[PDB]
Write an enzyme that holds these catalytic residues in place. Sequence first.
Site, PDB file in Angstrom:
ATOM      1  N   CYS B   1       1.034  -1.088  -0.142  1.00  9.63           N
ATOM      2  CA  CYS B   1       0.005  -0.087  -0.052  1.00  9.63           C
ATOM      3  C   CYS B   1       0.696   1.891  -0.047  1.00  9.63           C
ATOM      4  O   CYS B   1       1.850   1.061   0.170  1.00  9.63           O
ATOM      5  CB  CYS B   1      -0.847   0.244   1.263  1.00  9.63           C
ATOM      6  N   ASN B 231      -4.957   6.602   2.177  1.00  6.77           N
ATOM      7  CA  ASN B 231      -4.195   5.767   3.256  1.00  6.77           C
ATOM      8  C   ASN B 231      -4.617   6.109   4.386  1.00  6.77           C
ATOM      9  O   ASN B 231      -4.315   6.417   5.419  1.00  6.77           O
ATOM     10  CB  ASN B 231      -2.629   5.745   3.082  1.00  6.77           C
ATOM     11  N   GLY B 232      -5.232   4.623   4.810  1.00  7.95           N
ATOM     12  CA  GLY B 232      -5.727   4.667   6.513  1.00  7.95           C
ATOM     13  C   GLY B 232      -6.817   4.029   6.052  1.00  7.95           C
ATOM     14  O   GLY B 232      -7.201   2.645   5.294  1.00  7.95           O
ATOM     15  N   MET B 479     -10.815 -10.301  37.165  1.00  8.18           N
ATOM     16  CA  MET B 479     -12.002 -11.204  37.165  1.00  8.18           C
ATOM     17  C   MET B 479     -12.460 -11.184  35.861  1.00  8.18           C
ATOM     18  O   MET B 479     -12.807 -10.061  35.422  1.00  8.18           O
ATOM     19  CB  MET B 479     -11.711 -12.212  37.912  1.00  8.18           C
ATOM     20  N   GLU B 886       2.407  -9.878  29.444  1.00  2.64           N
ATOM     21  CA  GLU B 886       2.493  -9.011  28.773  1.00  2.64           C
ATOM     22  C   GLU B 886       3.125  -7.969  29.616  1.00  2.64           C
ATOM     23  O   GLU B 886       4.031  -7.137  29.308  1.00  2.64           O
ATOM     24  CB  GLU B 886       0.768  -7.930  29.530  1.00  2.64           C
ATOM     25  N   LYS B 937     -10.807  -6.015  28.496  1.00  6.46           N
ATOM     26  CA  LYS B 937     -10.764  -4.769  28.047  1.00  6.46           C
ATOM     27  C   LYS B 937     -10.612  -4.811  26.577  1.00  6.46           C
ATOM     28  O   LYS B 937      -9.261  -4.126  26.370  1.00  6.46           O
ATOM     29  CB  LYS B 937      -9.851  -4.155  28.724  1.00  6.46           C
TER      30      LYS B 937
HETATM   31  C1  LIG Z   1      -4.991 -12.694  36.133  1.00 13.54           C
HETATM   32  C2  LIG Z   1      -4.946 -12.081  34.376  1.00 13.54           C
HETATM   33  C3  LIG Z   1      -3.549 -12.060  33.654  1.00 13.54           C
HETATM   34  C4  LIG Z   1      -3.632 -11.330  32.364  1.00 13.54           C
HETATM   35  N1  LIG Z   1      -2.354 -11.376  31.771  1.00 13.54           N
HETATM   36  C5  LIG Z   1      -2.437 -11.193  30.103  1.00 13.54           C
HETATM   37  C6  LIG Z   1      -1.448 -11.202  29.881  1.00 13.54           C
HETATM   38  O1  LIG Z   1      -0.166 -10.776  30.233  1.00 13.54           O
HETATM   39  N2  LIG Z   1      -1.357 -10.601  28.036  1.00 13.54           N
HETATM   40  C7  LIG Z   1      -2.852 -10.881  27.837  1.00 13.54           C
HETATM   41  O2  LIG Z   1      -2.749 -11.061  26.182  1.00 13.54           O
HETATM   42  N3  LIG Z   1      -3.946 -11.176  28.255  1.00 13.54           N
HETATM   43  C8  LIG Z   1      -4.173 -11.041  29.315  1.00 13.54           C
HETATM   44  N4  LIG Z   1      -4.944 -11.992  29.747  1.00 13.54           N
HETATM   45  C9  LIG Z   1      -6.409 -12.391  29.669  1.00 13.54           C
HETATM   46  C10 LIG Z   1      -5.636 -14.229  29.982  1.00 13.54           C
HETATM   47  O3  LIG Z   1      -3.926 -13.941  29.123  1.00 13.54           O
HETATM   48  C11 LIG Z   1      -7.154 -15.225  28.502  1.00 13.54           C
HETATM   49  O4  LIG Z   1      -7.172 -14.447  27.221  1.00 13.54           O
HETATM   50  C12 LIG Z   1      -8.085 -15.147  29.436  1.00 13.54           C
HETATM   51  O5  LIG Z   1      -7.085 -15.402  30.678  1.00 13.54           O
HETATM   52  C13 LIG Z   1      -8.470 -16.559  29.870  1.00 13.54           C
HETATM   53  O6  LIG Z   1      -9.463 -16.254  30.052  1.00 13.54           O
HETATM   54  P1  LIG Z   1     -10.768 -17.141  30.744  1.00 13.54           P
HETATM   55  O7  LIG Z   1     -10.083 -16.267  32.172  1.00 13.54           O
HETATM   56  O8  LIG Z   1     -11.843 -17.027  30.779  1.00 13.54           O
HETATM   57  O9  LIG Z   1     -10.014 -18.594  31.306  1.00 13.54           O
HETATM   58  C14 LIG Z   1      -5.012 -12.078  31.716  1.00 13.54           C
HETATM   59  C15 LIG Z   1      -6.583 -12.610  32.123  1.00 13.54           C
HETATM   60  C16 LIG Z   1      -6.487 -12.272  33.188  1.00 13.54           C
HETATM   61  C17 LIG Z   1      -7.506 -13.344  34.155  1.00 13.54           C
HETATM   62  C1  LIG Z   2      -3.867   0.605   1.181  1.00 17.46           C
HETATM   63  S1  LIG Z   2      -5.903   0.755   2.758  1.00 17.46           S
HETATM   64  O1  LIG Z   2      -5.545   0.036   3.200  1.00 17.46           O
HETATM   65  O2  LIG Z   2      -5.416   2.453   3.057  1.00 17.46           O
HETATM   66  C2  LIG Z   2      -7.527   1.389   2.208  1.00 17.46           C
HETATM   67  C3  LIG Z   2      -7.673   2.271   2.239  1.00 17.46           C
HETATM   68  C4  LIG Z   2      -9.204   2.738   2.989  1.00 17.46           C
HETATM   69  N1  LIG Z   2      -9.492   2.347   3.932  1.00 17.46           N
HETATM   70  C5  LIG Z   2      -9.864   1.146   1.907  1.00 17.46           C
HETATM   71  O3  LIG Z   2     -10.775   0.089   1.976  1.00 17.46           O
HETATM   72  O4  LIG Z   2      -8.917   1.991   0.200  1.00 17.46           O
HETATM   73  O1  LIG Z   3       0.441  -7.032  33.536  1.00 15.39           O
HETATM   74  C1  LIG Z   3       0.313  -6.292  33.219  1.00 15.39           C
HETATM   75  O2  LIG Z   3       1.513  -4.787  32.903  1.00 15.39           O
HETATM   76  C2  LIG Z   3      -0.495  -5.671  32.969  1.00 15.39           C
HETATM   77  C3  LIG Z   3      -1.838  -7.151  33.461  1.00 15.39           C
HETATM   78  C4  LIG Z   3      -3.214  -6.814  32.521  1.00 15.39           C
HETATM   79  O3  LIG Z   3      -3.565  -5.771  32.142  1.00 15.39           O
HETATM   80  C5  LIG Z   3      -5.026  -7.413  33.061  1.00 15.39           C
HETATM   81  O4  LIG Z   3      -4.194  -9.093  33.439  1.00 15.39           O
HETATM   82  O5  LIG Z   3      -5.520  -7.577  33.251  1.00 15.39           O
HETATM   83  S1  F3S Z   4      -6.014 -14.504  42.827  1.00 16.31           S
HETATM   84 FE1  F3S Z   4      -6.836 -14.182  44.365  1.00 16.31          FE
HETATM   85  S2  F3S Z   4      -7.445 -12.372  44.087  1.00 16.31           S
HETATM   86 FE2  F3S Z   4      -7.505 -12.852  41.689  1.00 16.31          FE
HETATM   87  S3  F3S Z   4     -10.011 -13.735  42.861  1.00 16.31           S
HETATM   88 FE3  F3S Z   4      -7.940 -15.017  42.343  1.00 16.31          FE
HETATM   89  S4  F3S Z   4      -8.491 -14.978  44.165  1.00 16.31           S
END
Ligand SMILES: Cc1cc2nc3c(=O)[nH]c(=O)nc-3n(C[C@H](O)[C@H](O)[C@H](O)COP(=O)(O)O)c2cc1C
Ligand SMILES: CS(=O)(=O)CC[C@H](N)C(=O)O
Ligand SMILES: O=C(O)CCC(=O)C(=O)O
Ligand code: F3S
Lengths: 211, 1472
Positions: B1, B231-232, B479, B886, B937
């Site tokens: 692009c 672009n975008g 949680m 993370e 989130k």
């Molecule tokens: C305590 C905790 C820490 C987590 N930390 C990360 C993280 O560091 N990076 C990330 O990409 N997702 C993180 N997640 C999300 C998990 O990687 C995963 O996507 C999700 O936990 C699984 O959901 P389930 O909890 O119902 O088993 C975190 C989730 C929890 C509960």
């Molecule tokens: C290279 S591009 O990804 O910016 C494409 C731009 C635009 N959202 C489209 O659908 O044409």
């Molecule tokens: O430890 C961190 O910087 C992020 C952990 C986090 O964002 C999550 O577990 O919801």
């Molecule tokens: S970790 Fe401790 S507070 Fe997180 S809820 Fe699981 S009890």
Amino acid sequence: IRSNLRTFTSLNVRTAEGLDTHYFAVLIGVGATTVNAYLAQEAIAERHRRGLFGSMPLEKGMANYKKAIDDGLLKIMSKMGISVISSYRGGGNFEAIGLSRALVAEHFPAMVSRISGIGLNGIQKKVLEQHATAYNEEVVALPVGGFYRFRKSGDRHGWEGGVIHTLQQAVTNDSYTTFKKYSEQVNKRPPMQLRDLLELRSTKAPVPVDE
Amino acid sequence: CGVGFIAAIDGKPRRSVVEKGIEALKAVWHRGAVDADGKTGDGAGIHVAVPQKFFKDHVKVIGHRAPDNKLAVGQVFLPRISLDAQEACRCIVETEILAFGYYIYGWRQVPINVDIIGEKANATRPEIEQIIVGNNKGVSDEQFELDLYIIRRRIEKAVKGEQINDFYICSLSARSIIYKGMFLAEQLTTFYPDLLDERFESDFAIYHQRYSTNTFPTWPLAQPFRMLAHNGEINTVKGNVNWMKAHETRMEHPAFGTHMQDLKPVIGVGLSDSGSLDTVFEVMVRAGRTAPMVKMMLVPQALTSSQTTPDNHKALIQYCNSVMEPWDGPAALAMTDGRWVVGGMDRNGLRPMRYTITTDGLIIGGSETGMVKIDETQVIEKGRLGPGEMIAVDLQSGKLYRDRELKDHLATLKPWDKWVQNTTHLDELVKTASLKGEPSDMDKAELRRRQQAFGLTMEDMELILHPMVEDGKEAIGSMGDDSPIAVLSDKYRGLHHFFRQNFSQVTNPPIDSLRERRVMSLKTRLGNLGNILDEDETQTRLLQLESPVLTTAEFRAMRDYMGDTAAEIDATFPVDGGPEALRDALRRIRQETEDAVRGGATHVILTDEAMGPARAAIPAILATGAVHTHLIRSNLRTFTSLNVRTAEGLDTHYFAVLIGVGATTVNAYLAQEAIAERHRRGLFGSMPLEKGMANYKKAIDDGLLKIMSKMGISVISSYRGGGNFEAIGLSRALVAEHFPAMVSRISGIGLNGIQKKVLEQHATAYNEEVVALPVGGFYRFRKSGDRHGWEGGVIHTLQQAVTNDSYTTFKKYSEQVNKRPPMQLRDLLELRSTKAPVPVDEVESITAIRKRFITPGMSMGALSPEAHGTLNVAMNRIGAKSDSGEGGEDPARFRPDKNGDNWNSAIKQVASGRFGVTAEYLNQCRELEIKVAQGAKPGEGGQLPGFKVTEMIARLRHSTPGVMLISPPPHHDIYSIEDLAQLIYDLKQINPDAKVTVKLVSRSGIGTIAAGVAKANADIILISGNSGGTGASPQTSIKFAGLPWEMGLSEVHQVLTLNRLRHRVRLRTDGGLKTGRDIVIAAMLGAEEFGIGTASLIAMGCIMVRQCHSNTCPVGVCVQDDKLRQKFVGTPEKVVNLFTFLAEEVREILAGLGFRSLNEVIGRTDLLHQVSRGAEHLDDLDLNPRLAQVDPGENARYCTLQGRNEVPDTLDARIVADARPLFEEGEKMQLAYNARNTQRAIGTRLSSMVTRKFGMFGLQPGHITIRLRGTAGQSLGAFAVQGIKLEVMGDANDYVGKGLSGGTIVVRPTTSSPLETNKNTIIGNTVLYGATAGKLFAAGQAGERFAVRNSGATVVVEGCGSNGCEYMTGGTAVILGRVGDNFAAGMTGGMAYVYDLDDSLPLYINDESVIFQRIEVGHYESQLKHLIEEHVTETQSRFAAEILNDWAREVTKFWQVVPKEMLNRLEVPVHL
Ligand SMILES: Cc1cc2nc3c(=O)[nH]c(=O)nc-3n(C[C@H](O)[C@H](O)[C@H](O)COP(=O)(O)O)c2cc1C
Ligand SMILES: CS(=O)(=O)CC[C@H](N)C(=O)O
Ligand SMILES: O=C(O)CCC(=O)C(=O)O
Ligand code: F3S
């Protein structure tokens, strides 16, 4: 049609320019409910006045004319399998070579016109020229005509005597050269046919015939 | 692009302008999906001037005479398969040009060579034909395009009425013509030879290739568009689109004469986002506005209220903002109305855009820079655009205008300020009445009972409302969200529950509403909806708030000022009503508002106030939408403001929905009430009820700003009414009928259900006395009403099970779990099959199965060190995989221990704040997970409370101890899909063995993205459910962002299949999977891998008490506190037991189904049938769209080979080859090579190799040095460890030293360039993103977000775009020059000095976390000096050298920028 009115009347034409089966057919299936070629019943009369038919009543001459126009049609209709006029009418079963796209779309039912052609402006013009000829001057008789057959008239034809001769010549005396003047006779005229509108340029340089 | 543009500054046509235009297009392919097919691409285009020699001759050769004027051309795509249609098409095209009486010389089949096209494309190839028109009427340049414009629309319209498909007029003007199509840009010239003719000459150019979320090629969707090239992406599009539906209701200008109606709708169906933009941009320009004015009215720059901005500009801006609501989204634009040619930026500088100016009097606009050869020698300047800027050329006068000078000019056009001064800011008038006293008139006996009507609770009052009032911030929590999904709920939930906030994933980045709040905004205007077409001061006559938000005080303030002008509609309905009560109610309101508005009314006030024992309230959300829509549907919304009073409103989400479904203004009246009551029991203490509300209000204001940023949107006016939600649970018909466009992939309840539930809750509250609300167990399990997945019994039994190791206990748990009422979609499915059962022994083995399981990424930080490594040990013990998370991973951990246990984790993440991201980290794994998002989130990015930022933690992360880590919501190097694409390349470059994954979060639309991810070489794609867990996260996201995995996971399965990419990538999912069946069902929906977090936590002991953010874990799971970490009893053995059970329970199920393996059942949705009905009233869901198969019945089989989607070599390929000695003997080496904008990630492979043999630091600086002439393309030197040094004599593009890891990179202009080192750009954006070690030296300026997140690299550079040093946490950052807005925002820890010659830095820097002083202590002064010396030594920089020459006077000019939190930490204090 466009304005939902056509279902309210019949549409009837009186035409002077109308002579043979085709003209009726077109008219008819481009709207017409009823047609009346009134300047032909006339032309007929004059003919019948100078005794060209027998002592046959005009009433009868008319009948015949009508019958031919009736079979005129029935026939044009069967060329497409259609057996009935209500369905044929307005159906637009033509094809326009020559008129312009824009135009045919604007005014007639749906018919193709794979090459727009002239439009209102030209039509206007040619119409009027031919009109002068008959009023903005004086006229004794209709010219001869050379449509259905080459006379040494103004309507040209592909096969006209000259060229025919040269051909016959060419192929009897058997000279390629004579052949070659015939084709020229034939190729040098004004365009008469679409291929006639096409030049042949190419981007290669010439190769020797022997090859 | 790419987008690009070229222009002859003098105005005079040339062939080089086109030849350059091609030249460009030949250097962008490194940024796209190459097909193995060699031909197929998404679209390319070049927009140049109609070349009158070339055309005229043509007309001559047929034997006409060339006119004196300019001759027009239509460039047209006709249907190519139905001759019948091509005609209709040409008659129409001719008719229309004909009634304007112009002239047709006639058609010309364009030469083209379809050999270079792929079939997919030749399939949809239209029949390309030119039609040549003449200005027989002898009108003027300006009149010709005007007329032609009305003609093209006329055609466009008629073809549409005819119902003709595939017709399309790229261009049709006598100035410009467009040659775009679906073929590789490098081959534009091949598919269209006209372009190679010397008669093609031109004063300007605009090229553009494009990418997509597709395999399907539409031709009209390739750009450039008619005026525009983009672009975008414009995330704010549905917003814009619906606004125009009203903007139009009034647009009228005299230039179109009687034509306007043919002129509308300005936006036809089937347009791409940019396409729609061009559409609007065009009308506006066709009516008189210049190009530059329009860029502004539509993509205005941010009005930061600051000194940075002259006052002329501010006027203007304010003008625009009042006429038209922006079109937001990352956007590099290349534009031109007939005369001007403009390069523009979006308000956040979201996309690259370099440019060069030459001695030959040309400007070449670009996306990257090495894009077209130019001799340094003839370069007079080397710029770029920053957020909001433009650069332009007025071709009529052959004058170039840079941003300032151009904006100067436009300020000049009218009395912007005088006009602006025409607005009534009813702010102060409103604040006044608040201080005069936020009233309250209900007695607790009431509050309580209404409150009960909308089913409110204590949890609601204590947990969520309170913190708002107190801290002026919204409740944070922890949680996942394990409650039912609202439709399935058992308990009155309010509409807002079913609307999910949308957010953005790879298409565009979300913004930082903390660090970047200055660009955002909540201004609100009542009555500013008139003629986008007009340009008269009467356009400033409107009232203006600064938040759609009003306290009961301020509300009435306003409602009075309005008066005769306002109208009040009764959003309420009888209960004695009948089955149709609410329906007719909804009609009524709809009508009454009509009449009112017609009647002359100019403001509407919709309200539940008359709610009583005899009248239920209409759900404000539903009432607002019903009204706004019908208003649009009758062209009336343009005449009023629409303001709502709601008794049910309470949190941020509710406002967001209301607003974006119409609402101008909102007043949560029964909540200010509830606030008071709290306040008279002194629950807020000393604090006046007024300051009370104030806070509330800020919490809801930042509330919104946030929810918005989740889909990069910076401004409420575009957001409003945009319907950015997705409905889960309400019926299709309904959602269509009454709210703006939103998806509701399964219909749900409708009015009749809604009615019934509304009324039930109603009886609850007027059927008898009410002294206390119920407790509530929505945000937490109480043994009360709301159920949750994880509830005590269930947790105990599981714990019992993995602790005592009994599968029988496990089975009793899962039964406990499966025997409840449906709570989640999968719960509504039965699994029936047609095979007789098989013996369990026969099925695949646990060893086998458990390997498809993984333990998600949960950070070191969020969890105790003990918990974290526990997991790594369990997973490696059973040959599976775990995910670092993370936040770093300690490298000690890179070996198995005496006991054989292995603490190292197999899959490492890469997320926004690049935590421990290091050449060695990236290399200690089998898989890299790009974390674009978590279901807890989505829109946002991690948090780690400061008191969890232990020191070990801080050491890991290169952060500052005990200071909080909030992450940037978007990755800084992933602003659009090509961007993703390139990250994946670097990733596969630094680690040749790993697969790359992309964590995405289910939501409708994921499918499509999923595809692009696939074309971008990702190996695995993971879709996360709305309900997953987080250690810390605001509660609205935990309860309102995301969608169930059952929807997103199939959508990806489907779409990927539908584009034949589904075999290119493996699929993974997580979100609440606690049971054998949960895992089978996910397979049938398409999954191959399953992630299990929380339940793995629970086995390690979690008791689900929810204080993960607090650092008070009863059990040592998620807490950094020492004493508390000693209460941890997790064990590998426990987790291993968890997985063992799960798999065995999976095998138990497959056997019943007749399958002997999981694979035999992936995708097999025919094995699932939706049963469950689970309510009293006939309100059902449609689970079909999830169960459907794309190509049902037998599948063909595409052989997939075992490994990873491989990638093309780069320079590193040779560098390595040339370095034999390095690796073989240890030698030191100096290599030289040229470098083009087309070579990416140079060195990175080298680095991987070096890190592998000597480690990040076993080589002494400069050991292997590679000089490079030319231009480096993206990711230059990314992840370079020490020992490597790259000198780039020439220049570079974005991401120099991304993740720098102790390596060294230097970049200076060519010895021969005559450029003033410091007055010219030299390296792109997001330089040093997340670095941790090494130096970088740059004879020149750097672009936006320089040194973002730097965590320990030392750099010297002569200038820098905006948003610099942002979120920096370590390192030294010198800076010989001017510095962009918001400098140092969130800069918690490192230090930057900053030579500032105008004592301006004060006006640009972001105070909040940093301070600046002049150097005082002399070790800080010495530190600087030595760097600058280094800099010079490396870069031979004059300007630098000179500062050295006058050190004395000069040191005087810098400014030490030092982080507050670093003041007391710093060995040597900064002060005397
Ligand atoms: C305590 C905790 C820490 C987590 N930390 C990360 C993280 O560091 N990076 C990330 O990409 N997702 C993180 N997640 C999300 C998990 O990687 C995963 O996507 C999700 O936990 C699984 O959901 P389930 O909890 O119902 O088993 C975190 C989730 C929890 C509960
Ligand atoms: C290279 S591009 O990804 O910016 C494409 C731009 C635009 N959202 C489209 O659908 O044409
Ligand atoms: O430890 C961190 O910087 C992020 C952990 C986090 O964002 C999550 O577990 O919801
Ligand atoms: S970790 Fe401790 S507070 Fe997180 S809820 Fe699981 S009890």
